[PDB]
């Protein structure tokens, strides 16, 4: 069983993570330098194993894919979803059924259709128009980016987009997003260690359970509004398709599709899309205002390939290596999902001599892969040029894994990439981005299951 740093009795390394000035993924990378690529932590009595660097992360999630495909049975995840749904589903027939349905649905109701790309572009127009509203005055992009990004998924799930005046839906996403953040909280690591803490009426765990209630109700209401006009066997979207599957499993009682599992799946798909993609864009914008020379080079490429008023296109990607370079270097350098989503072993495992008992939490420290000095030159530097080959084309790197690897890898990778590219290009084509009174902006990320920047104002002035 892998060695690791010691911590106090009862609470273990929750203390050492807690009392460290460094964020958890940074903490963990330093400890691998002392204990090895694979080390352990005692998180209040839950034994967890951390994987660090590209080699062991691959060795587990890819070479032993079925053994590390599971999710851990932490009290919070048992309470929230009973380990059904998709994202936190146990590895099994339930997960196979939901994953398959989701993959096919995103293909069929999404990027598999010729008209889909223009629906993204339609959204960049609402988005850019909303930006113009402010007439170059400083504001926070967080809301608009969130609205716009979530609508690309709303099309696939609910068959429609919600307007930017829809503050009810926005409120539901703000609570759900708070929950993704509180999930990384010391309060929650303790709650999972000591679930009797649930008797305590105050604290971040009660905020999370309350939020989850409000969110669960809202999602079931949306799912009901989206199933009104349903024509059995002729689905308009993911919700209809899910209901199709419940029909075909009415006689199969071991069928895993359920009304509860539909709310969990929809919630998981919606929050997975909105949290992550939004943040990528928010980091990118931050860095383009910080480094105008880099912003300007992207803009130069846009004008050469797309012109001043051309509609951006997914097909343009491969004529725009520098743009693709910047975007990949944001994924690598900001690590929007720094520790991925926790895994667990689906059976007793043996990795590099160490034994890992069935059910152990396994943390894949994706941050440490992107800063693995065996595969990256000076990874502590933001430098898009590292993704360019000697002819100036985009050069893909094996050790860039911001959508993780193996059986559980991001289901939305492709969709995210189109969203990112089309939103970033549409925005930079129309605007110049800089800070107010050249304010000194903060680049220290906010502690959560995803990394987002602190609130920052930005000025968007039209270019032509
Ligand atoms: C920049 C955008 C995104 C990033 C960086 C990202 C990252 C990730 C990561 C690191 C995982 C962990 C997989 C694991 O357990 O090892 C994941 C899983 C997942 N992602 Fe994404 N994601 C993004 C966008 C999306 C979008 C747009 C969707 C859906 C529309 C999505 C849906 C999911 C789902 C459902 C899972 C769980 C898959 C499973 O458990 O089988 N993600 N994502
Ligand atoms: C769906 C439903 C159904 C609706 C309920 O309110 C609860 C719920 C999800 C709850 C959570 C809270 C805990 C943290 C979870 C389990 C997130 C998980 C830690 C992954 C977050 C990282 C991801 C955005 C990359 C995803 C869903 C989150």
DSSP for 389-439, written as a single string: -TTS-B---TT--TT--GGG--TTHHHHHHHHHHHHHHHHHHEEEE-GGG-
Q: Are 2 and 36 in contact (CB under 8 A)?
A: yes
Q: Are 275 and 450 in contact (CB under 8 A)?
A: yes
Which residues lie closer than 8 Å to 85 by C-beta, 6 or more apart? 98, 261, 264, 265, 267, 268
CB-defined site of ligand 2, < 6 Å? 76-77, 80-81, 87-88, 179-180, 183, 212, 215-216, 219, 263-264, 267-268, 271-272, 275-276, 337, 341, 449-450
Pairing of strands 361-365, 46-52: parallel
Q: Are 37 and 56 in contact (CB under 8 A)?
A: yes
Which residues lie closer than 8 Å to 11 by C-beta, 6 or more apart? 44, 190, 193
Cα(427)–Cα(421) distance, integer angstroms? 10
Cα(4)–Cα(230) distance, integer angstroms? 54
Pairing of strands 46-52, 38-43: antiparallel
Pairing of strands 431-434, 459-462: antiparallel
Cα(34)–Cα(31) distance, integer angstroms? 5
Cα(451)–Cα(195) distance, integer angstroms? 26
Q: Which ligand has the nearest atom to the CA of 86? A: 1
Q: Are 348 and 355 in contact (CB under 8 A)?
A: yes
Cα(461)–Cα(464) distance, integer angstroms? 10
Which residue spans within 129-254 are E strands per DSSP?
none
Q: What atom in ligand 1 is closest to the CA of residue 279?
A: 1
Cα(311)–Cα(422) distance, integer angstroms? 10
- What is the residue with the minimal CA distance to atom 23 of ligand 1? 276
Q: Name all contacts of 347-350 with Cβ < 8 Å and 24+ positions apart.
A: 347/67, 349/64, 349/67, 349/68
Task: Please identify which residue in the block is written with the tokens 């931050």.
Answer: 286
Breaks (C-N over 2.5 A) in the chain follow: none
Q: Binding residue per annotation — 60?
A: no
First and final CA of the chain: distance in angstroms?
Answer: 62
CB atoms within 10 A of CB 241: 17
The DSSP symbol for 62 reads: I
Give whole-number Cα distances, 371 to 52, 63, 180, 323, 333, in Å: 10, 22, 24, 21, 8
CB atoms within 10 A of CB 432: 17
Q: Within 13 Å and on the Cβ side, how many CA atoms surround 228?
A: 6
H helical segments located in 291-387? 292-305, 321-334, 366-370
Q: Within 13 Å and on the Cβ side, how many CA atoms surround 329?
A: 25
Lookup: tokens for 398? 């094996």
If phi > 0 it is left, if psi is from -120 to 50 it is alpha, else beta; for residue 184 that is alpha
Give the H/E segment covering residue 34: helix 24-35
Q: Binding residue per annotation — 410?
A: yes
Q: Is 416 in the pocket of ligand 1 (CB under 6 A)?
A: yes
H helical segments located in 306-412? 321-334, 366-370
Between vectors from CA 430 to CA 421 and to CA 322, what angle results, nearest 5°?
40
Cα(275)–Cα(441) distance, integer angstroms? 22
Pairing of strands 46-52, 349-351: unpaired
Resolution, Å (one decimal): 2.8
* Domain region containing 257: 1-464
Q: What is the DSSP string of 273-291?
A: HHHHHHHHHHHHHHHHHH-
Helix (H, G, I), strand (E, B) or coil at 361: strand
CATH of the domain at 210: 1.10.630.10
Burial of 76 (0-12, 13-18, 19+ CB in 10 A): buried
**Torsion angles phi and psi, residue 420, rounded to 5:** -50, -60
Helix (H, G, I), strand (E, B) or coil at 433: strand
Cα(30)–Cα(52) distance, integer angstroms? 10
Q: Are 226 and 169 in contact (CB under 8 A)?
A: no
Q: Which ligand has the nearest atom to the CA of 191? A: 2
Cα(16)–Cα(94) distance, integer angstroms? 36
Q: Is 409 in the pocket of ligand 1 (CB under 6 A)?
A: yes
Selection from 381, 385, 341, 386 nearest residue 361 by Cα? 341
> How many domains does the chain fold into?
1
- What is the residue with the minimal CA distance to atom 17 of ligand 2? 180
Instruction: From 403, 404, 407, 451, give the residue whose CB has the most ligand 1 atoms within 8 Å, as the site to mutate.
Output: 403
Which residues lie closer than 8 Å to 102 by C-beta, 6 or more apart? 86, 238, 265, 269, 411
Q: What atom in ligand 2 is closest to the CA of residue 275?
A: 24
The DSSP symbol for 448 reads: S
Give the H/E segment covering residue 226: helix 204-227
Residue by residue, what is the 3-state secondary structure of 103-143? HHHHHHHHHCCCCHHHHHHHHHHHHHHHHHHCCCCCECCHH
Sign of CA dihedral 50, 52, 55, 58: positive
Cα pseudo-dihedral 124, 128, 130, 133, rounded to 10 = -170
Lookup: tokens for 241? 């398709």
Q: Are 129 and 136 in contact (CB under 8 A)?
A: no
Q: Which ligand has the nearest atom to the CA of 342? A: 1
Q: Which ligand has the nearest atom to the CA of 336? A: 1
Q: Are 81 and 68 in contact (CB under 8 A)?
A: no
Cα(426)–Cα(144) distance, integer angstroms? 14
H helical segments located in 335-409? 366-370
Q: Is 273 in the pocket of ligand 1 (CB under 6 A)?
A: yes
Lookup: tokens for 235? 């689905």
Q: What atom in ligand 1 is closest to the CA of residue 401?
A: 10
Supply the Cα-derived Rg of the chain in whole angstroms: 22
Lookup: tokens for 358? 């069935």
Q: Are 263 and 216 in contact (CB under 8 A)?
A: yes
Sign of CA dihedral 211, 269, 17, 280: negative
Cα(409)–Cα(341) distance, integer angstroms? 10
Q: What is the DSSP string of 208-222?
A: HHHHHHHHHHHHHHH
């Amino acid at each position: 069983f892998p060695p690791g740093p010691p911590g106090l009795p009862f609470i273990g390394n929750i203390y050492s993570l807690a009392a460290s000035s460094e964020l958890p993924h940074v903490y963990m990378r330093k400890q691998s330098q002392v204990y090895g690529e694979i080390f352990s932590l005692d998180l209040g009595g839950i034994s967890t194993v951390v994987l660090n660097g590209y080699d062991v992360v691959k060795e587990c999630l890819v070479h032993q894919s079925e053994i590390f495909a599971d999710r851990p049975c932490l009290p919070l995840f048992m309470k929230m979803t009973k380990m059904g749904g998709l994202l936190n589903s146990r590895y099994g027939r339930g997960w196979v059924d939901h994953r398959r349905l989701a993959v096919n649905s995103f293909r069929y109701f999404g990027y598999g259709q010729k008209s889909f790309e223009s629906k993204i572009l339609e959204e960049t127009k609402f988005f850019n128009d909303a930006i113009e509203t402010y007439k170059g005055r400083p504001f926070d992009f967080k809301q608009l980016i969130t609205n716009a990004v979530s609508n690309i998924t709303n099309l696939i799930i609910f068959g429609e987009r919600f307007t930017y005046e829809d503050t009810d839906f926005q409120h539901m996403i703000e609570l759900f997003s708070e929950n993704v953040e509180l999930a990384a909280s010391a309060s929650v690591f303790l709650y999972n260690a000591f679930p009797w803490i649930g008797i305590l009426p105050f604290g971040k765990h009660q905020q999370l359970f309350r939020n989850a209630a409000v969110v669960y109700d809202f999602l079931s209401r949306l799912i009901e509004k989206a199933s009104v006009n349903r024509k059995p066997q002729l689905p308009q979207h993911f919700v209809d398709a899910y209901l199709d599957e419940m029909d075909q499993g009415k006689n199969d009682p071991s069928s895993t599709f359920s009304k509860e599992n539909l709310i969990f799946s929809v919630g998981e798909l919606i929050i997975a899309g909105t949290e992550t993609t939004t943040n990528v864009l928010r980091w990118a914008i931050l860095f383009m205002a910080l480094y105008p020379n880099i912003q300007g080079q992207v803009q130069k490429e846009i004008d050469l390939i797309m012109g001043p008023n051309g509609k951006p296109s997914w097909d343009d990607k491969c004529k725009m290596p520098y743009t693709e370079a910047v975007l990949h270097e944001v994924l690598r350098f900001c690590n929007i999902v720094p520790l991925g989503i926790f895994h667990a072993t689906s059976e007793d495992a043996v990795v590099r001599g160490y034994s890992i008992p069935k059910g152990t939490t396994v943390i894949t420290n994706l941050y440490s892969v992107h800063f693995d000095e065996k595969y990256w030159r000076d990874p502590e530097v933001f430098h898009p040029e590292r993704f360019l080959d000697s002819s100036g084309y985009f050069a893909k790197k094996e050790a860039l894994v911001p959508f993780s690897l193996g059986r559980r890898h991001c289901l939305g990778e492709h969709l995210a990439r189109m969203e990112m590219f089309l939103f970033f290009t549409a925005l930079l084509q129309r605007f110049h981005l800089h800070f107010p009174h050249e304010l000194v902006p903060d680049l220290k990320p906010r502690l959560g299951m995803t990394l987002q920047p602190q609130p920052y104002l930005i000025c968007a002035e039209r270019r032509h």
